[PDB]
Amino acid sequence: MDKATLVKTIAYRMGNVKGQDTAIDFELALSIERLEGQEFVPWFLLSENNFFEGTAQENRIPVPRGFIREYEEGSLYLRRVAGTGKCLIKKSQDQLLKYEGMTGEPSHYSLTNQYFRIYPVPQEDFKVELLFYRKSSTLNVEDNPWYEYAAELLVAETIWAMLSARRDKMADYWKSVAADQMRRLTILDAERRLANQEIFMG
């Protein structure tokens, strides 16, 4: 929420705390980061549309900052100066080595390790469109999304961490609470992604 109610809730729940608010702040921030590193991506982590321009003869394109994983039913889009566009395809490096030396429009790419590579290599500067999942520390919206939605996970995990530090039993209980909450949010993600889609074969 407003980052204050959360702190006072943490203080009240774990035994009417008075002065550990500094440790509260330090360890709380840590929580948001930890959760982000975890295999799951909630919807409100999704970044807005991005674009980039790359110079001629440079088939290597570095990863966008704060990137984690691309959007599944989204894909890399090539935008031309005439307003016309196209969506490039993805293949493993191996499949795509063949084109080494074919000039023209870009068509494919590979994730590789940290840099994007397009084997159809243009001879001029060119613009790209991209979408991906980004950390909250690196998004351009004013407020941190995590506080607003899923506060509870955030309340619990910091407490689980805070309580586990002092070697206290209830650590397992709070960890179970956090696990239940995470399963709930994982269900809720699919609740929205496939909310009202209509499908038919072809």
């Binding site: 807005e48 549309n49 991005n50 674009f51 980039f52 321009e53 570095p62 966008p64 900052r65 991209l130 351009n140």
Partner: peptide, 19 residues
């Protein structure tokens, strides 16, 4: 490294129907 972030300036407001 020139990923620019397009800005969203379009007005955001809704309305509700009276019973």
């Amino acid at each position: 490294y020139d990923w620019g972030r397009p800005v969203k300036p379009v007005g955001s407001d809704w309305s509700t129907d009276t019973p």
